[model samples]
Target: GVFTFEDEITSTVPPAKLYNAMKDADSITPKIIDDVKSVEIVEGNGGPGTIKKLTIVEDGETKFILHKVESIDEANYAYNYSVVGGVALPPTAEKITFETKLVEGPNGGSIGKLTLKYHTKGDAKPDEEELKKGKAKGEGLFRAIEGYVLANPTQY
Candidate 1:
């Protein structure tokens, strides 16, 4: 079974600035999100083939998520990755891919759009409740990064 989710977030920052912040997530994510303790590249160079691990604290319990970068397009401000291993993974999900794009918004800001594709195992399918929860988390992360960029105008 497979499921797809898509949505967008509007940020007050410019497209290039917002894109850089997310592009350099290994260095910028932890600075904006308190739950994110750290992000490290454990395999390959810090590029399309890289595998990054994120250490996070959920409800006071520390957990880890490993993601494999599938693609990166700096010129277009696009990125894609797969959830190779993570606490956020659904029990019935065999694979999950996340795709993101940053573009110029109407009000001189940036629009961040994301798509999530879930591949389930056997006859299983992703739960609607879980999908909503995951979407909320993704939106929250984008907002956090936007807030950080808005506060620090010159830093990427």
Candidate 2:
């Protein structure tokens, strides 16, 4: 079976700024954050078809996630990627993909929206909470970036 999930976040920052924040995230996060140790490019350039690895900390364990880029756009403030390896990708799913877009909002910020897709092995009902938890962790990055960008107004 397959499942689609959608959720969004609103920020007071412009869409492009948020995009720029993400552009700088490769180094910005690893250097300043406690949860992430490093973000590396194990294959290809940082564009489409590239695989980015994140060495992260979970509780007392150190885990990693290898994500492959499907597409990325600067003008539209959009990104699409998939989790290819690492982490605990429960046995029920074959693949997990996500598409995110940042649009300008009235608050002079950005409205970040996400589309999460799950490819399951069968019609077996997937744990919605598990999927939810995945995105919750993913979304945590946005919260960090939003504050970082605002705090360092002169920087990315």
Candidate 3:
């Protein structure tokens, strides 16, 4: 794994619930991402190959845009997404894919492990700083979803 970042978040919710959430990334991004202007599934339904238009506010007034999607694998309770087109990414850059796997935890709970991987091109390459920023963003997403589950219990 030359370019990868792994992070996990544990929740009291079941694996199925968590897995379902991963498939609706468009809705998930805005709910968690800090200062995300909005997330729109411009094409597809957040499934594999979907193009998500993301508008995010980076530093108070600075905004950035990116397109992403879900690589759903319900059986394994996991999915991944990547940047297909975005204002922040360079033309030569490959899509940055982010994936997560959910599994059953003790006491009928669930745990999710997320991994981010990608390759950048042009005059610059991704470094530790870039990875840290991305990781922090991912953690924010996981925490928000976890919080949502804790606050709103689903009827079985």
Candidate 4:
């Protein structure tokens, strides 16, 4: 079975431009975000079915996560992907799927609609507290992207 969670986030960056930031997140985020050490492509081009590994150094050890793009709607600014494996993938879950869409919002801002789906093992479900904790990080990532865009207008 699958469990899904959804949220809406606001960003001052316009939809088209902000979508680029998200599309290039693996490549660009590491430059601005200190926590992520690096992101590299493990297979294929950076498009549908492409696999990437995101590395992070926590404590004295190294941690990472893997992402595989399921599909992307460039015109509509919709992205779909899955966490095939990594520290972010808990034992309670078999796979985690994510779908995100950026739409026009007030002023120059954009509204980010997000959905997180967990494909769990038989009778396995993540606790709400645990899921929420995961979401906070995801939201923080969006804000960080927005921060970077605002801070470096020319970069985008």
TM-score quality measure for candidate 4: 0.91
List TM-score per model, in order.
Answer: 0.91, 0.90, 0.79, 0.91
lDDT of 4 by residue, 21-120 (tens): 8877877778777778898999988889999899987776799989999999999998888888988888888888888888999887899888888898
What are the RMSD figures for all models against the true structure?
Answer: 1.5, 1.6, 2.9, 1.6
Candidate 1: clashing pairs of residues:
none
Model 4, position 81, has a per-residue lDDT of 83
Q: lDDT per residue, candidate 1, 1-156, as tens digits? A: 778888888877888888777766777678888899998989888778898899999899999998899999999988888887888777888878888889899998888889988899989968777687778767876777677778887777
Poorly placed runs, candidate 2 (over 4 Å): none
Stretches of candidate 1 off by over 4 Å are none
For residues 5-37, could you state the per-residue lDDT of candidate 3 as single tens digits?
677878888888766665555566676666776
At residue 31, candidate 1 shows an lDDT of: 83
Q: What would the per-residue lDDT of candidate 2 be over residues 16-44, giving only the tens digit for each residue? A: 88898887777788766788999999998
Model 2: colliding residue pairs: 1-122, 12-109, 13-109
- Stretches > 4 Å off in candidate 4: none
Q: For each of the candidates, give the backbone clash count.
A: 0, 3, 0, 0
lDDT leader: 4
Model 2: which ten-residue window has the lowest total lDDT? 86-95
